[PDB]
Design a protein around this ligand. Structure first.
Ligand SMILES: *[C@@H]1O[C@H](CO)[C@@H](O[C@@H]2O[C@H](CO)[C@@H](O)[C@H](O)[C@H]2NC(C)=O)[C@H](O)[C@H]1NC(C)=O
Ligand SMILES: *[C@@H]1O[C@H](CO)[C@@H](O[C@@H]2O[C@H](CO)[C@@H](O)[C@H](O)[C@H]2NC(C)=O)[C@H](O)[C@H]1NC(C)=O
Ligand SMILES: *[C@@H]1O[C@H](CO)[C@@H](O)[C@H](O)[C@H]1NC(C)=O
Ligand SMILES: *[C@@H]1O[C@H](CO)[C@@H](O)[C@H](O)[C@H]1NC(C)=O
Ligand SMILES: *[C@@H]1O[C@H](CO)[C@@H](O)[C@H](O)[C@H]1NC(C)=O
Ligand SMILES: *[C@@H]1O[C@H](CO)[C@@H](O)[C@H](O)[C@H]1NC(C)=O
Lengths: 106, 49, 172, 172, 172
């Protein structure tokens, strides 16, 4: 006449595999993903002020290429340059274009 | 919509510490890494019968 | 695990324990039953949450940076800009890999620890009234009904009450 | 801690132990007293000093570098110089954060270990002459005066001397 | 080590054990002998190999990069290129140093663990038929010939067979 007392721990039907120091794949009861790998596909207009350049590069809105006149005096947190942008004024070049676009953008 | 972190692919959530979406980012963003997945264990060893 | 309890001297886990991470199963005159141990479950969970809070923690905020994609071949300065970004990404990739691997090793070890702590706390409670059977189970050498089992789980089991009876059964 | 001694089965520490990190308190026919254990105190300290020497270790020496403050807007090349420094500082900031957190987890665990090692060494010394009472204390089932207690702390306690007496008291 | 077995309660290792990492030595009526324990040897080794596979793992592949040696003094842009490389090398140097130190601490601790797991598995097998003598050795209180010792190493030793005999010897 006596009893038995058993010590134990839970398991689950659906464990997941994780990586350790000594083991490339070992099974735990749960884990969480630490790498964001998907996007909704859209740029959110809050909380940063997004200015869509549409047909215009920053430099063209700067100089005032006529089709870019809508951008006069605009402010932005993030200026979005689209691949379909085009120039339509006097043909020009900017020495250190990258630097001018940088400092204005900033 | 509202989101702190922007990438050319669109906005991404920032609950996680890393991201595999784009090395280019604006705002409060997870740090960009080469791995597409890193799982952090949140329970003990699963040992069924 | 580093203590040898989970996936060690305890053969396997219990899918039927759905209200705690650690617990007791007993057999006695009235049958068999189970119960979760809250305080060890909470210990494991708290540590794991501590570790999550440290990691899910606020991402840094960066704004204007360098460019990382280029439409024309330029040479020296673009070589540098690319090498700089490629060097940062590799370093961060390494960090993330090491982090996850260290944390996971430690998570598996700490949960092993808790199982082992609970066992040892139990062994101590029973004193000379029980023997360790080697598989995580205690043979208890006295009549031990549901309340008695209950007192072992509450931590109010008074071994002196059962001592003459157990010693007598153990040594014959 | 991962062993369950400090902030576990030992309720609390002793502010009155001022000459060691670990030690014994006893109660017997002549009263009560305390003493530090030197060898476990030294073990904890040595490890901790090892870890300090590794960290307080010689800083690297750098001389001429890049500039890090700028009075004029310049564009591409200054963007790079800033991004380079900002990337290094974040990486080093991360390292320092991780280091301190790992070391601290390990420091708390190793000191827990030592407490637990000392206890186990003691349990082994006493053999069948004592029972573990669950709170870090041993009930000793024979008359054990100050010298006897002293021999337990020296490691020269001869359990066979007290065995017939203890077994008799333990089992009745 | 964090468990206190290797370089702890086991005085020293055995150069004569050449067919395993852990094992048993026995003394009985027929003499003395030794044998390796395969399953604990394999546990230590497997973990260590896991850790080697993670480290000896495929190096990254880089091709065209920046230049790192320079024959003329140029100023600002070369300052940057040098600072970039010097910053990466220091970060990687740090990583490599930390890695090796963490792994080594963990390697010494895990092998300590295994020794301790094997001991505890043995203590459990023998139940009330043996006492721990404090130095890693079990005094067994019954006649225990080579096959009996063999059953202890196989894990098929039936303590109930020897129990009346051992209890009688232990308590007198
Ligand atoms: C897997 O692990 C995570 C992290 O411990 C768990 O998710 C949390 O669960 C709580 C309580 O239900 C929620 O309130 C939290 O918001 C969750 N945190 C996170 C990080 O998402 C979850 O319990 C586990 N999943 C399963 C199926 O058990
Ligand atoms: C975000 O955008 C980048 C670049 O537009 C995408 O990366 C491309 O992935 C495809 C398929 O895997 C490759 O063939 C391309 O060469 C990649 N381009 C670059 C520049 O790396 C990426 O897939 C997008 N991310 C998500 C998850 O939508
Ligand atoms: C941009 O360019 C195309 C071609 O000129 C035109 O059809 C479209 O209306 C322009 N978009 C806007 C919004 O101005
Ligand atoms: C748990 O402890 C309480 C309070 O001391 C006691 O009333 C009860 O009997 C114990 N539980 C069981 C199931 O015996
Ligand atoms: C400590 O050991 C020494 C040397 O064997 C012995 O003389 C002494 O009795 C022991 N200490 C006490 C307080 O008994
Ligand atoms: C090991 O176990 C086997 C199989 O049960 C048994 O035949 C044998 O007696 C054991 N070994 C020794 C040396 O006794």
């Amino acid at each position: 006449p006596g009893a038995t007392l058993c010590l134990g721990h839970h398991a689950v039907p659906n464990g997941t595999l994780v990586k350790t120091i000594t083991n490339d794949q070992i099974e735990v009861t749960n884990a969480t993903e630490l790498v964001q790998s998907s996007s909704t596909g859209k740029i959110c207009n809050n909380p940063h002020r997004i200015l869509d350049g549409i047909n215009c590069t920053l430099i063209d809105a700067l100089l005032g290429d006529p089709h870019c006149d809508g951008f006069q005096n605009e402010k932005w947190d993030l200026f979005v340059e689209r691949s379909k942008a085009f120039s339509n004024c006097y043909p020009y070049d900017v020495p250190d274009y990258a630097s001018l676009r940088s400092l204005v953008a900033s | 919509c509202s989101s702190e972190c922007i990438t050319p692919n669109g906005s991404i959530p920032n609950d996680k510490p890393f991201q595999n979406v784009n090395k280019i980012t604006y705002g409060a963003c997870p740090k960009y890494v080469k791995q597409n997945t890193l799982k952090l264990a949140t329970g003990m060893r699963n040992v069924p019968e | 695990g580093i203590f040898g309890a989970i996936a060690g001297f305890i053969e396997n886990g219990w899918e039927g324990m759905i209200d705690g991470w650690y617990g007791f199963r007993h057999q006695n005159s009235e049958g068999t039953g189970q119960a979760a141990d809250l305080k060890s479950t909470q210990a494991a969970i708290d540590q794991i949450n501590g570790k999550l809070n440290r990691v899910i923690e606020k991402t840094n905020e960066k704004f204007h940076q360098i460019e990382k994609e280029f439409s024309e071949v330029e040479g020296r300065i673009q070589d540098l800009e690319k090498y700089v970004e490629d060097t940062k990404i590799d370093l961060w990739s390494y960090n993330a890999e090491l982090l996850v691997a260290l944390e996971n090793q430690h998570t598996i070890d700490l949960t092993d620890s808790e199982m082992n702590k609970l066992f040892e706390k139990t062994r101590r409670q029973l004193r000379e009234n029980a023997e360790d059977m080697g598989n995580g189970c205690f043979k208890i050498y006295h009549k031990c009904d549901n309340a008695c089992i209950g007192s072992i789980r509450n931590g109010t089991y008074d071994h002196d009450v059962y001592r003459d009876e157990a010693l007598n059964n153990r040594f014959q």
